[PDB]
Amino acid sequence: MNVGTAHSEVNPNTRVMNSRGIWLSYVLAIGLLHIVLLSIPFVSVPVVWTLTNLIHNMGMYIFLHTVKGTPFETPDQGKARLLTHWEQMDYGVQFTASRKFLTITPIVLYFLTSFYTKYDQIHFVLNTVSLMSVLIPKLPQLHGVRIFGINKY
């Protein structure tokens, strides 16, 4: 419904990651993706793990660092009309439990997929490129800056 009916906060999008059971749901979604990837018959284990890493990282990048704004009308007159979700999170507070969790989890996934890929160099470079693509925007310095003016408006 309309924003402000049961809560005075102008931008609810900044609290969705601080809710109850959201972290458990995130981990369960990763696990379900891994299971449905293992379900494929003709794909080997290291390929499955690198696909898990790549798909999770791509989806995370798309949702956190690509889509900007809010999916609903907001009564602060579009203050966050250009900010992405990672920038909207917690009203710009750079370190928080949710931000720490979201930054840590791809690194743990990278460690697991490096162990299960037997440290192959091709998988190493693929997973490292993906991990950098996810971890670079999380830097506090890289806040509100668009390289070469891409996705600015």
């Binding site: 299971i35 449905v36 293992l38 379900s39 494929i40 018959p41």
Partner: protein, 62 residues
Amino acid sequence: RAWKQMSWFYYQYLLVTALYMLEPWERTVFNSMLVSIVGMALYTGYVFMPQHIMAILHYFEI
């Protein structure tokens, strides 16, 4: 009796998965994808994993 119970369980499935508010073709798409994934998983589990769970199911049936 049992048909009513199964219809109730399907209703609960619709409520939980939010399929209740979708249109029929969206329900068809979601159900087809779900059954395809379950069938593929069963095929993989039978082909590769040993039938130890099948032995447990047979023991439970007996």
